[PDB]
Write a protein that binds this ligand. Structure first.
Ligand code: FAD
Ligand code: FAD
Ligand code: NAD
Ligand code: CL
Lengths: 263, 338
């Protein structure tokens, strides 16, 4: 079986902090990483490779420096990597990004399974995987909690707010991944074989993707403005008495007086 | 090229009727309240779109909650949400009636649905929005958190139609039902049936007979890795029972086997906005805080005075949750009696 994992390099937005005193955005420890939900998607592909012998290709639409993410993928055992890089793809919304990715995937031949993260932690739209699936006319299951393959079918656990569910579909299909075990470790050997690999770089012209469907030109939406939201500082009343019975008395009498706990 | 480009003749704001046990989920009513204001701003109608096996008396409730129009597409295949069935039915109605904008609650399934529709129609979609406005001409201004809530973006879909967004639940207020409102039910017959390519082989209710779900609980009593053992969750059940609340946990709690995934709070689980969230042995990772930071009051019980969760907690105790909980629960119970 052939698997394509769509991976995205992102700033580590989990490291961003708005200071509630200044309302300023602090970026201490923010570096570019592999999108964590993409690390789950990749680890899932790798588990299927271990189990069944699958061929795993990772593809990203990013600037040149996004190459490092592809290297990290190869370093943990992905078979092949492709970098889709051209300023013509820049400025893309999720429609334009999915159009580029869907057309890239088709060009090389649609695999048996396409895995995406549930969302990217920068945009946080959770739109690209289902949009890819629609562009390619394939069935989807979003927000996988577990993924298995049984013959020619993919078996996916997914919840909603009321129900815990399991679905099956025939390959070729698209799954977006909410969770898997943490992506496996890349050894020194792994990283060296990755460093030596050829990673082709594809322009829009090389892939014959029309310019008007990609980048800004292919984007129905446009970000008009962005801002750091205000964060109201909370001035907590925190009791740290030795005797937990004392701390609890204080806490409860305050919750009572402040109308938090009622009769 | 030109797919999805505006005709200029599009009109009305549509709200997707997500339903369970036949009945709209509350985010539907939230969106009808907000979108009622937007539709009035641009002098267009507000429509609810109901794809179901059995409309029951639901169109009446949708009208009472602000809808001028209710589009109904009924078929047995629609009993449960499915990407393939609902995307088809929703897109046939967009094609037929040509709305200006569409609004989908950013629930698990809404987040599945929205991007399928947007790509099928070839239009713009803004995700999990928290602030909405409209120009007199019907152009919707979508504002949303990005980057884990660290950046807000204000976005426009200027030329493609309908202008689409998913909208964060528990953000906007519903209107009180108004028995005196009037509206029009339009029954839409499917032109082309489809086969669902996705088969459900297991569908289990996460909440038991008459028990409380975290999703809608006025109080949430939540445990992390600092609860130490699964059996110690009984402490949280005791506190929930004293309050009339529900029990939740961190992803670490799920991983340690303390709780099942449907009680997980955070960006990969549920977002809850209870009157109180008791955070017990939970550090307050950003991924957890994503799911509970809009709780009215947060009470933190944690051994580590530098736990990030204290940062956002109006009240708390530095100490051992295993000693503090049963004293807290007793004291609350005493107050509530006789
Ligand atoms: C602040 C901000 C707000 C934005 N809001 C919107 C908006 O509401 N609507 C919108 O249409 N666009 C928005 N964008 C643009 C958007 O971030 C990009 O189009 C991005 O390429 C994809 O969407 P995302 O980051 O939400 O990823 P998601 O849709 O969350 O990504 C889902 C999955 O798709 C795959 N994928 C995403 N990007 C790539 C990539 N470049 N290469 C390979 N695979 C990938 C990965 O598997 C990923 O985990 C916004 C950008 C900014 C900076
Ligand atoms: C992509 C991604 C998505 C994620 N999604 C989510 C999600 O949806 N929800 C989620 O919760 N996390 C999520 N996480 C995980 C998150 O990063 C943390 O690992 C997790 O929230 C930590 O859970 P915790 O606070 O229970 O445990 P820890 O961080 O290990 O904290 C345990 C706490 O217990 C305290 N403690 C110890 N003993 C006691 C005692 N006797 N009494 C009181 N306190 C005590 C300690 O002081 C500490 O503060 C995600 C992470 C990634 C990377
Ligand atoms: O949205 P945003 O603010 O993150 O803005 P952005 O234009 O930097 O990025 C938007 C999207 O375009 C891609 N991208 C940017 N430059 C590219 C290039 N040269 N080649 C291919 N893909 C490119 C990004 O990886 C992302 O998926
Ligand atoms: Cl399709």
């Amino acid at each position: 079986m052939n698997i394509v994992v769509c991976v995205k390099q992102v700033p580590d937005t989990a490291e961003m902090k708005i200071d509630p005193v200044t309302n300023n955005l602090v970026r201490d420890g923010v570096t570019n990483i592999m999108n964590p939900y993409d690390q789950y998607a990749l680890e899932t592909a790798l588990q299927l490779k271990d189990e069944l012998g699958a061929h795993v290709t990772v593809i990203t639409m990013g600037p040149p420096h996004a190459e490092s993410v592809l290297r990290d993928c190869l370093a943990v055992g992905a078979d092949e990597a492709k970098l889709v890089s051209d300023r013509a793809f820049g400025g893309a919304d999720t429609l334009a990004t999915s159009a580029a990715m869907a057309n890239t995937i088709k060009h090389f031949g649609v695999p048996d399974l396409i895995l995406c993260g549930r969302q990217a932690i920068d945009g946080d739209t959770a739109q690209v995987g289902p949009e890819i699936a629609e562009h390619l006319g394939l069935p989807q299951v979003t927000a996988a909690l577990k993924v298995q393959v049984k013959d020619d079918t993919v078996v996916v656990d997914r919840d909603n707010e009321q129900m815990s569910m399991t679905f099956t579909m025939k390959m070729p299909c698209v799954v977006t991944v909410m969770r898997s075990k943490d992506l496996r470790f890349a050894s020194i050997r792994g990283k060296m074989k990755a460093r030596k690999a050829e990673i082709p770089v594809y322009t829009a012209a090389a892939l014959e993707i029309p310019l008007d469907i990609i980048g800004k030109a292919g984007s129905p939406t446009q970000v008009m403005k962005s801002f750091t939201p205000k964060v109201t500082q909370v001035h907590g009343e925190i009791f740290d008495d030795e005797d937990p019975a004392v701390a609890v008395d204080k806490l409860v009498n305050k919750l009572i007086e402040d109308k938090i706990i009622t009769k | 090229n030109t797919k999805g480009l505006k005709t200029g003749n599009e009109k009305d704001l549509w709200v997707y009727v997500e339903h369970y046990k036949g009945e709209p989920v509350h985010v539907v009513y939230e969106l009808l309240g907000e979108c009622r204001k937007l539709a009035d701003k641009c002098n267009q109608k507000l429509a609810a779109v109901l794809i179901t096996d059995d409309a029951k008396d639901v169109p009446s409730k949708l009208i009472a909650r602000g809808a001028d129009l209710v589009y109904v597409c009924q078929d047995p295949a629609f009993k449960y949400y499915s990407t393939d069935e609902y995307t088809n039915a929703f897109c046939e109605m967009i094609d037929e009636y040509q709305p200006s904008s569409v609004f989908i609650g950013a629930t698990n399934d809404g987040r599945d649905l929205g991007p399928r529709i947007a790509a099928r129609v070839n239009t713009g979609l803004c995700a999990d929005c928290t602030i909405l406005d409209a120009e007199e001409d019907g152009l919707i201004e979508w504002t949303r958190p990005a980057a884990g809530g660290n950046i807000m973006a204000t976005i426009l879909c200027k030329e493609h139609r309908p202008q689409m967004g998913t909208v964060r639940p528990k953000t906007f207020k519903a209107m009180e039902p108004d028995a005196s409102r009037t509206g029009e039910v339009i029954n839409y017959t499917l032109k082309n049936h489809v086969d669902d390519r996705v088969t459900c082989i297991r569908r289990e209710e996460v909440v038991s007979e008459g028990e409380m779900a975290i999703d809608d609980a006025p109080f949430v009593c939540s445990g992390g890795r600092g609860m130490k053992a699964k059996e110690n969750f009984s402490l949280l059940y005791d506190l929930a029972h004293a309050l009339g609340g529900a029990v939740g946990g961190s992803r670490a709690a799920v991983d340690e086997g303390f709780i099942e995934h449907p009680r997980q709070v955070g960006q990969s689980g549920k977002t809850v906005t209870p009157k109180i969230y008791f955070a017990c042995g939970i550090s307050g990772s950003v991924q957890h805080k994503a799911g509970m930071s809009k709780s009215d009051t947060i009470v933190c019980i944690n051994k580590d005075p530098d736990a990030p969760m204290f940062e956002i907690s109006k009240y708390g105790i530095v100490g051992d949750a295993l000693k503090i909980l049963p004293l807290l629960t007793a004291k609350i119970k005493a107050f509530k009696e006789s």
